[PDB]
Amino acid sequence: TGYDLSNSVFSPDGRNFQVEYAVKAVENGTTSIGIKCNDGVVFAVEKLITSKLLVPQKNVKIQVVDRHIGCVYSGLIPDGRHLVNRGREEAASFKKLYKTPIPIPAFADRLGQYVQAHTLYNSVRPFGVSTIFGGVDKNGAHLYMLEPSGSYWGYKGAATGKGRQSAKAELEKLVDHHPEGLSAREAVKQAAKIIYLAHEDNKEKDFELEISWCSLSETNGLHKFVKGDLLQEAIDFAQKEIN
């Protein structure tokens, strides 16, 4: 034994236990999801209200990269911010050299290679976050989810955090019942419901819902936060479904 004391060490199984321990920090975090719709993507996250003293709508969790990519994560929040800062540097250098905004699959690999690099040495710690991200490019909508190992795939729907099992089950129903697809406005409504349903795993404290979206028709392919009337409409739809 001792194989789990140092990052980048293979156990006799062929496993990197330090990466697996980073996953435990992710599983401890709040629930975040992503939904791929007809011409874009929707992101949503559970924000635990630890106290009444928290200013509502101020501690924003979802982050924008460039102007067309949204990023949300569960686990160690600072680690997620560090990853998004890198993502922003990657997107800037891509656009600087190639002019066009970074495509989503291209952006996904940039994050992937950087996270994977933190599994190669014992002088660094793996990322304590799973990141759900995506947006619209020239080839349409893309949704990705990235793990501490550096592993990522494309998704129809994605979920991570403490209430991921509940969320996944809900996402699987939407995929089955809508083979033709889901509209952007529908996806926002469904995203609200799923976070509310996933909040049963974090039922002790009450929470605040935060949603964002990129859609070709609804936001001109730019990342925007769901605010005001559209947010309230989604909250009402969500509250109606849990009762």
Partner: protein
């Protein structure tokens, strides 16, 4: 246990013990309170002395005309982080002729602390910070933890026995948020809040430290006979 030798090591349950130990240093530190209304933001700090011959350790540091913080934990780490904030506030003014938003200041502190939690050789910061400020979106209060977590709040407290002050502010929330255009009453609410964390000792003239920033009020620190009015 076997996973607390350095900051670069997760425990089997996904914890970072060196960061948690750094968090423990804040709990040993002296209590400090932060609260705000829509016009002003206030810091109140209980200073700690070594003995009766010694001075009382300063707790509040000015970062700019419109921003400053109070500390709890390792004081030299607060000096490093406050120096960084002074530089960032200053970079914004010199390059962009722009006062640094309090929310952006929090994001910068988060990222600086984070780098010390993921790399070998270094250590986490051993101090907690309460940042107050008045910018283009009004008054603000931030709580900084050396884990990297920064949180915007109406009111809060950190340090030893800070739970008492935090509960008081949670009750008084609806009252003190409405104290607009009255700096003295907002400070009173802060002095009353920090009083819920005292045991055996009481607030004296060289014990108490207060700071305030607001709409037409530069960040100013009050010590000595300047706080006798509030005792």
């Amino acid at each position: 246990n076997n996973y607390d030798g350095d900051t670069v090591t997760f425990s089997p349950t996904g914890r970072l013990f060196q960061v948690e130990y750094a968090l423990e240093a804040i709990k040993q530190g002296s209590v400090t309170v932060g609260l705000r209304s829509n016009t002003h933001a206030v810091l109140v700090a209980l200073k700690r002395n070594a003995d009766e011959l010694s001075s009382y350790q300063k707790k509040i540091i000015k970062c700019d005309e419109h921003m400053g913080l109070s500390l709890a934990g390792l004081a030299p780490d607060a000096r490093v982080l406050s120096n960084y904030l002074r530089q960032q506030c200053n970079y914004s003014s010199l390059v962009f002729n722009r006062k640094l938003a309090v929310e952006r200041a929090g994001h910068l502190l988060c990222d600086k602390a984070q780098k010390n939690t993921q790399s070998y050789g270094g250590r986490p910061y051993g101090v907690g910070l309460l940042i107050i400020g008045y910018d283009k979106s009004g008054a603000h209060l931030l709580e900084f933890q050396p884990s990297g977590n920064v949180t915007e709040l109406y009111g809060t407290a950190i340090g030893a026995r800070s739970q008492g002050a935090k509960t008081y502010l949670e009750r008084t929330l609806d009252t003190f948020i409405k104290i607009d255009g009255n700096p003295d009453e907002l400070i009173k609410a802060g002095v009353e809040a920090i009083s819920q964390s005292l045991r055996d000792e009481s607030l004296t003239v060289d014990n108490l430290s207060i700071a305030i920033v607001g709409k037409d009020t530069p960040f100013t620190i009050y010590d000595g006979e300047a706080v006798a009015k509030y005792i």
